[PDB]
Amino acid sequence: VVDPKKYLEESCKPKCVKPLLEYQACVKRIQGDDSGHKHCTGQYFDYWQCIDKCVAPKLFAKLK
Amino acid sequence: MDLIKYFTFSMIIFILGIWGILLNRRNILIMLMSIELMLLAVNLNFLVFSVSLDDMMGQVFALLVLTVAAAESAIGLAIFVITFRVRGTIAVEFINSIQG
Amino acid sequence: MASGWGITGNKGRCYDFWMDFSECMSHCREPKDCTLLREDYLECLHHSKEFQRRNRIYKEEQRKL
Amino acid sequence: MILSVLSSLALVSGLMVVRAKNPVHSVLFFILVFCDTSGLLLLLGLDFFAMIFLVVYIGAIAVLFLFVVMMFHIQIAEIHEEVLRYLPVSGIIGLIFWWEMFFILDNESIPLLPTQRNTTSLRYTVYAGKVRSWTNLETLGNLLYTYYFVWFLVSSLILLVAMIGAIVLTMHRT
Amino acid sequence: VKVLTYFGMTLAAFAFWQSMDKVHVWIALHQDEKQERMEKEAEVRRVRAELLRKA
Amino acid sequence: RYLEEEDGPLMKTIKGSITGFGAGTIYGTILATWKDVPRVERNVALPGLIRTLKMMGTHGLTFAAIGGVYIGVEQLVQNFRSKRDFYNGAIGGFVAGASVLGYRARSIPTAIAAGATLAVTSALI
């Protein structure tokens, strides 16, 4: 039907608002190219690291 | 920075009253004077705020608190006199009979 | 400065702002409708935002020096 | 600077009120704290309150304290205690109260930092207020007895209670 | 106390009050960082409650 | 309702021990100030200050031990068992209470009583 992990990844977003808003601000701060070397990988990792730590201890219950 | 400096003047007097309570467990007369120091600091607060806000209500209340402070001191020292007259001493060990 | 009596014998510096805020609150059933007038009155009382802005100017002057 | 001098004088004099061995000296240092307060009031332009603090606090209240304390002949043994052990508790209490209250206005009343520019030239003068100016005395007297007369009368009731209670508690008629 | 002791305690108190002046200037200089940090913490709470009500 | 943190079991234990020491220092100061001074000590100041500081340090130590061991055992329960409940923690309160307050009181029934009380208190939360 619908992926349990994907649903849980959207439902854990409130727990990770701070890494999200820092990633969102990094995206804005690099919208100008500057010869294409600026990126937001670090803020990306912090957001998904927080998201993964929220989804991990509840995903395996929805799985048989 | 004028307002902060006047305020901290009054605040130091208030803290000195608190410390004087804390530091005089054998000296109940100094405790009464510490309470008068706190009352003075409050009066200063009212006057400073009255000036800072261009409002007269702080001055009216300062005068009335003056009347109250005088009445409190008169009654307080009367009770001190009758306490001493009964006991012959002002030591705190003679005013601790009521307890439990 | 909500009473009106000034310390030099004239209308208080912040009385008109107080009266604007009060008249707004007397008929607006939501306090948020009179937020601007309320912060006008409080700004008159303490000059917080004015002094903050002037300190910004001073800080920028010190930075460019 | 001047406020720093007055604050330092008041701070030392208050410490001496709360730390003097002899209570007579304590009452005398209290007179110095009230004189310093009068100076602060003069700086704020409130000369009536500056004089009244002299008349009432020093001229009447401190005199009563002095009469009582002097006639009590307190012996230093009845009231002596070593205060070294209270440095930690005084430290914590005073530090909490300091960090919280010496800086209570800072968020609400942000200080204006002095710049290297003459801001005195932006003082706006309104001459209409200066035609017939009011003293502190008549500005207060305009309110005490008319718009706020009930509180005036309640204060009289407070004074009456003080007179009655003083007589009842201490009088021994010859 | 000795008169010199009262004078010295006054000098020390004068130094304390000048130090307090420096503290007040330091607090006044950091109003902007306080304001910017408060911007974040209030907006985090908004983005948060809005996301928590999407479900 | 709880989604404002960054956690870390070792960080949790360290911060809890530090908070315990602070609270124990405050409590020891209060207790030292409440007491009178022994009569042989009324006329000399320094031994009173030494006793106050000793009381401060001893109470800071015992409170730090409680505030550290409690959360340490709480996480070491919820880490191995890996179930989040009020049960995880009732054990930490019990072991903190028993160990520290029975080492202090030198009594086993007192250790059991203290652990039981801490268990109920942590259960309500």
Curated annotation (Swiss-Prot), chain A:
Pfam families: UCR_hinge
Coiled coil: none
Domain of life from the UniProt record: Eukaryota
Membrane topology listed for this record: Peripheral membrane protein
Family recorded in the similarity comment: Belongs to the UQCRH/QCR6 family.
Function of the protein: Component of the ubiquinol-cytochrome c oxidoreductase, a multisubunit transmembrane complex that is part of the mitochondrial electron transport chain which drives oxidative phosphorylation.
UniProt-recorded name of the protein: Cytochrome b-c1 complex subunit 6-1, mitochondrial
Species this protein is from: Arabidopsis thaliana
From Swiss-Prot, chain B:
UniProt keyword Translocase present: yes
Entry membrane topology: Multi-pass membrane protein
Assigned GO CC terms: mitochondrial membrane; NADH dehydrogenase complex
InterPro entries: NADH_UbQ_OxRdtase_chain4L/K, NUOK/Mnh_C1-like
UniProt-annotated location(s): Mitochondrion membrane
Catalytic activity from the UniProt record: a ubiquinone + NADH + 5 H(+)(in) = a ubiquinol + NAD(+) + 4 H(+)(out)
GO biological process, one term: ATP synthesis coupled electron transport
Top-rank taxon, per record: Eukaryota
Membrane-spanning residues: 3-23, 28-48, 62-82
Pfam families: Oxidored_q2
Molecular function per GO: NADH dehydrogenase (ubiquinone) activity
E.C. no: 7.1.1.2
Similarity annotation: Belongs to the complex I subunit 4L family.
Subunit text: Complex I is composed of at least 49 different subunits.
HAMAP family linked to this entry: NDH1_NuoK
Job of this protein: Core subunit of the mitochondrial membrane respiratory chain NADH dehydrogenase (Complex I) that is believed to belong to the minimal assembly required for catalysis. Complex I functions in the transfer of electrons from NADH to the respiratory chain. The immediate electron acceptor for the enzyme is believed to be ubiquinone.
Protein name listed in UniProt: NADH-ubiquinone oxidoreductase chain 4L
Curated annotation (Swiss-Prot), chain D:
Substrates-to-products reaction catalysed: a ubiquinone + NADH + 5 H(+)(in) = a ubiquinol + NAD(+) + 4 H(+)(out)
Keywords linked to the UniProt accession: Electron transport, Membrane, Mitochondrion, NAD, Respiratory chain, Translocase, Transmembrane, Transmembrane helix, Transport, Ubiquinone
Protein origin, superkingdom: Eukaryota
Top-level enzyme category: translocase
Annotated S-S bridges: none
Principal location: mitochondrion
Molecular function GO labels: NADH dehydrogenase (ubiquinone) activity
Entry EC no(s): 7.1.1.2
Record has Acyltransferase as a keyword: no
Keyword Transferase: no
Membrane topology value: Multi-pass membrane protein
Location(s), subcellular: Mitochondrion membrane
GO cellular component, one term: mitochondrial membrane
Transmembrane segments: 48-68, 86-106, 150-170
Described function: Core subunit of the mitochondrial membrane respiratory chain NADH dehydrogenase (Complex I) that is believed to belong to the minimal assembly required for catalysis. Complex I functions in the transfer of electrons from NADH to the respiratory chain. The immediate electron acceptor for the enzyme is believed to be ubiquinone.
Miscellaneous section: A stretch of 270 kb of the mitochondrial genome is duplicated within the centromere of chromosome 2 resulting in the duplication of the gene. The expression of the duplicated gene (At2g07731) is not demonstrated. It is also probably not RNA edited and therefore differs in all the positions known to be edited.
Subunit record text: Complex I is composed of at least 49 different subunits.
Family note: Belongs to the complex I subunit 6 family.
Name of this protein: NADH-ubiquinone oxidoreductase chain 6
Swiss-Prot record, chain F:
GO molecular function terms attached to this record: porin activity; protein homodimerization activity
Entry annotated with the keyword rRNA processing: no
This protein's GO CC annotations: chloroplast; chloroplast outer membrane; cytosol; mitochondrial outer membrane; mitochondrion; plastid outer membrane; pore complex; TIM22 mitochondrial import inner membrane insertion complex
Listed GO biological process terms: monoatomic ion transport; protein insertion into mitochondrial inner membrane
Domain of life, source organism: Eukaryota
Region (Contains beta strands): 1-59
Entry keyword set: Acetylation, Chloroplast, Ion transport, Membrane, Mitochondrion, Mitochondrion inner membrane, Mitochondrion outer membrane, Plastid, Plastid outer membrane, Porin, Transmembrane, Transmembrane beta strand, Transmembrane helix, Transport
Topological type in the membrane: Multi-pass membrane protein
Protein's cellular compartments: Plastid, Chloroplast outer membrane; Mitochondrion outer membrane; Mitochondrion inner membrane
Protein's job: Voltage-dependent high-conductance channel with a slight cation-selectivity; selective for amino acids but excludes triosephosphates or uncharged sugars. Non-essential amino acid-selective channel protein and translocation pore for NADPH:protochlorophyllide oxidoreductase A (PORA) and possibly PORB.
Subunit relationships: Homodimer and oligomers in membrane. Part of both the NADH-ubiquinone oxidoreductase complex I and of the TIM17:23 complex. Interacts with TIM23-2.
Protein name: Outer envelope pore protein 16-3, chloroplastic/mitochondrial
Species the sequence originates in: Arabidopsis thaliana
Gene that produces this protein: OEP163
Residues of the full protein shown: 7 to 131 of 159
